[PDB]
Amino acid sequence: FRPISVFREANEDESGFTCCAFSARERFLMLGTCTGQLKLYNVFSGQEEASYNCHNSAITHLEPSRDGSLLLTSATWSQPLSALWGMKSVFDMKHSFTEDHYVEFSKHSQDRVIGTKGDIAHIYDIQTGNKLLTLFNPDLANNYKRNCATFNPTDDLVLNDGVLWDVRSALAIHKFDKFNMNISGVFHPNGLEVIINTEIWDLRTFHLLHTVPALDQCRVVFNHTGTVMYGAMLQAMKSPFGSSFRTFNATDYKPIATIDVKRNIFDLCTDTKDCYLAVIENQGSMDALNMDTVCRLYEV
Ligand SMILES: N=C1C[C@H](c2cccc(Oc3ccc(Cl)cc3)c2)CN1
Q: What upregulates it?
């Protein structure tokens, strides 16, 4: 993990990057800010190339589409709280998700959006913007404080609130027991395993495969080949993670490394060639008047 590049936000006393994802264009990183702006930066030069105001509150998440034509955003207290933006020719808003606090694309074919409102998942058609399904069973809920509904790699399962749903039947097939208060779970890209905080479960048998204590309270990201798993722990805007990330072998969940960057972490993401890890790091403490974040680029 060699440092390659570092930059702060242009024309800012105090630097406000909150989250990042690589653009479909090679050398260019998208970043959200605490004033609800989307910015496009040269990740090597640190030159700000473009700026749009998407929301009148801080960006909490973004995800570009694989084909570079679409972008999802989520903000903090703005209405609408999340939105879908078009990026071909002019930048403009296509649809808005009035109360969804988090949104993701479908993974296999990026024709659908899945949004989260508290305990409840919503699915949307991208063309029409219509709500196709609501996935919510109050007898099966876990009430995860940081619930984030997500499609599996083939788009036919959904994890919401520790419940596995079958998208075609709108049927709850399994509720995983609650073993923490905050983390709801992601799908392994291999389509066989789901990862919920420190537990790894099998999708065909529901047997526990692994305990990984160092994942506690971590947000999980995979590299694009699905051979490496990165973990950023949430904190005991304000700083969403503490100051270290762990890397694990994705097939056997053995630790490769614990990197301590000595700064609280806001976000991290991989490029599509698994060449680079981009990390948002706060130089200030939680008690500073203002945020002071930088984006560091590391070679992996
Ligand atoms: N109203 C408009 C829309 C248009 C415009 C202005 C600035 C920037 C831009 O592209 C961006 C911005 C942010 C990201 Cl992350 C990616 C691309 C488009 C010209 N005028």
A: Up-regulated in a number of cancer cell lines (at protein level).
φ, ψ of residue 213 in degrees (nearest 5): -55, -35
Ligand 1 in reach of 77 Cβ (< 6 A): no
**Are the beta carbons of 103 and 60 closer than 8 angstroms?**
no
- For the chain, what's the residue count? 300
Which residue in this structure is represented by tokens 């399994």?
174
* Integer angstrom CA distances of residue 189 from 107, 226, 235: 10, 6, 26
Residue ranges of domains in the chain: 1-300
Resolution in A: 2.6
Q: Which residues contact 134 (CB under 8 A, 6 or more apart)?
A: 120, 121, 122
Question: Residues of 34-53 as b/e, b for ≥16 C-beta within 10 angstroms?
Answer: bebbbbbbebeebebeeeee
For residue 215, the SS3 value is helix
* Nearest CA-CA partner of 231 in 258, 204, 208: 258
Report the sign of the C-alpha dihedral through residues 272, 277, 283, 286, in that order.
Answer: positive
Nearest to 163 by CA among 179, 171, 209, 220: 171
Task: Ligand 1 pocket test: pick from 39, 48, 91 the residue with the most ligand atoms within 8 Å of its Cβ.
Answer: 91
Exposed, middle or buried, 85 (CB in 10 Å: 0-12/13-18/19+)? buried
Instruction: Give the residue, by CA position, lying nearest to ligand 1 atom 5.
Output: 91
**Could you report how far apart the first and last alpha carbons of the chain are, in Å?**
5
Q: Is 38 in the pocket of ligand 1 (CB under 6 A)?
A: yes
Query: What separation in Å is there between the alpha carbon of 90 and the centre of ligand 1?
Result: 7
Distance between CA atoms of residues 82 and 93, nearest Å: 11
Q: Is 62 helix (H, G, I), strand (E, B) or coil?
A: strand
Reading the block at residue 11, the tokens are: 């024309």
